[PDB]
Write a protein that binds this ligand. Structure first.
Ligand SMILES: Nc1nc2c(ncn2[C@@H]2O[C@@H]3COP(=O)(O)O[C@H]4[C@@H](O)[C@H](n5cnc6c(=O)[nH]c(N)nc65)O[C@@H]4COP(=O)(O)O[C@H]3[C@H]2O)c(=O)[nH]1
Ligand SMILES: Nc1nc2c(ncn2[C@@H]2O[C@@H]3COP(=O)(O)O[C@H]4[C@@H](O)[C@H](n5cnc6c(=O)[nH]c(N)nc65)O[C@@H]4COP(=O)(O)O[C@H]3[C@H]2O)c(=O)[nH]1
Ligand SMILES: Nc1nc2c(ncn2[C@@H]2O[C@@H]3COP(=O)(O)O[C@H]4[C@@H](O)[C@H](n5cnc6c(=O)[nH]c(N)nc65)O[C@@H]4COP(=O)(O)O[C@H]3[C@H]2O)c(=O)[nH]1
Ligand SMILES: Nc1nc2c(ncn2[C@@H]2O[C@@H]3COP(=O)(O)O[C@H]4[C@@H](O)[C@H](n5cnc6c(=O)[nH]c(N)nc65)O[C@@H]4COP(=O)(O)O[C@H]3[C@H]2O)c(=O)[nH]1
Ligand SMILES: Nc1nc2c(ncn2[C@@H]2O[C@@H]3COP(=O)(O)O[C@H]4[C@@H](O)[C@H](n5cnc6c(=O)[nH]c(N)nc65)O[C@@H]4COP(=O)(O)O[C@H]3[C@H]2O)c(=O)[nH]1
Ligand SMILES: Nc1nc2c(ncn2[C@@H]2O[C@@H]3COP(=O)(O)O[C@H]4[C@@H](O)[C@H](n5cnc6c(=O)[nH]c(N)nc65)O[C@@H]4COP(=O)(O)O[C@H]3[C@H]2O)c(=O)[nH]1
Ligand SMILES: [Zn+2]
Ligand SMILES: [Zn+2]
Lengths: 108, 104
């Protein structure tokens, strides 16, 4: 039946985008995969289908690595404000960079 | 003639740090390796032996990379103001991140 195509991992990372009310959002990722991510929304209304451009932020030691992304909201949990998102139009460099982060995180 | 321990490449990258004049420096790299980098000095005096804490920045596509690093000036060509620098005590995670980015 339905199958998650990419493993989802809880590696430390942040999402930054401009949402409703032209308010910026800076939130901790609940999980991350080659296909998308999840985070906890912040008060401002958000609904499945909403589309945003933003930056994925990764920091370890004195490395900071950033990824500009387009994502569409695919689920919003009213109780927890959990928002689940799908990347749209990921460039091959981006895809590969994501997989590097995720492969390294898996197995240490 | 010496064999360079790390291979050097010419890619779009910049170095930022606070110089001797206490004013900011923001310069394009001449080249980069996992061991260090070079750039042309334009402002304040700078000499071999100087230590700085800086930020190495790279950006291609939607990808942006940044490494906070201590570096030591190894050489300065007084004529061209070419500065050659060596990274100080990088973590293996950081060297590996450099060797990755370079390999391209
Ligand atoms: N990946 C995923 N998709 C979801 C989920 N909830 C709804 N869907 C999607 O909506 C279809 C119907 O979901 P369902 O009503 O729970 O109806 C499901 C459900 O009754 C059952 N089922 C499928 N996988 C599982 C499972 O892992 N555990 C249990 N207890 N039942 C499952 O088979 C039916 C058909 O499933 P699918 O053909 O895959 O088609 C599913 C799926 O495409 C979810 O939690 N995870
Ligand atoms: N890291 C992360 N990515 C997210 C999240 N929400 C959406 N995405 C990404 O967006 C893809 C499409 O989401 P979908 O349309 O809801 O289409 C989904 C959805 O219908 C279903 N599904 C998968 N996992 C679940 C689940 O846990 N609960 C429910 N109800 N459905 C699920 O399976 C389809 C395909 O799943 P994927 O192949 O993984 O493909 C997902 C995933 O790459 C999230 O919370 N975290
Ligand atoms: N439309 C959509 N919604 C998503 C997606 N991913 C997560 N969600 C929503 O976020 C809820 C929590 O996701 P979870 O923590 O991964 O917690 C999930 C997860 O651990 C598990 N699960 C459900 N489907 C799958 C699957 O297809 N593959 C795997 N590995 N786990 C699944 O079941 C738990 C509860 O799933 P849900 O009741 O459906 O509750 C999910 C769902 O409402 C997605 O891809 N598409
Ligand atoms: N001044 C200097 N430059 C270095 C040194 N090591 C590498 N290079 C530079 O790297 C280029 C390619 O080096 P190579 O692969 O060894 O490729 C070189 C190498 O195979 C060979 N070669 C040139 N000089 C020598 C030498 O003195 N001893 C040996 N065994 N081979 C040499 O000729 C190839 C083309 O030489 P180039 O046109 O000059 O282009 C050289 C040269 O610009 C060095 O130790 N000193
Ligand atoms: N103190 C110090 N100064 C450095 C260093 N690397 C570069 N420089 C200085 O900046 C010039 C190098 O520019 P290049 O593009 O690598 O172009 C270089 C380079 O391609 C080649 N080459 C010369 N020596 C070597 C070597 O020992 N090993 C290798 N692999 N190539 C060399 O010949 C060109 C001219 O080399 P130079 O006449 O020496 O002129 C050099 C030198 O004055 C360093 O590691 N330490
Ligand atoms: N990307 C880049 N990194 C730099 C530069 N200058 C210094 N570094 C980094 O700092 C290390 C020590 O530089 P060095 O003391 O001048 O000690 C140098 C230097 O004495 C010699 N050397 C290598 N290439 C050249 C050259 O082209 N010209 C001259 N005159 N000497 C060179 O080989 C030694 C070791 O060089 P490396 O193994 O590569 O190891 C170098 C390198 O990792 C630069 O201009 N560009
Ligand atoms: Zn299923
Ligand atoms: Zn030669």
């Amino acid at each position: 039946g339905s199958q998650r195509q990419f493993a989802r991992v809880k590696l430390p990372a942040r999402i930054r985008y401009i949402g409703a009310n032209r308010e910026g959002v800076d939130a901790r990722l609940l999980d991350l995969s080659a296909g998308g991510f999840a985070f906890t929304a912040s008060g401002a209304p958000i609904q499945p289908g909403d589309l945003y451009k933003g930056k994925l932020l990764f920091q370890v030691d004195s490395i900071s690595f950033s990824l500009e992304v387009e994502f569409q909201v695919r689920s919003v949990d009213p109780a927890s404000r959990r928002v689940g998102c799908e990347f749209q139009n990921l460039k091959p460099r981006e895809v590969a960079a994501l997989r590097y982060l995720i492969t390294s995180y898996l197995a240490g």
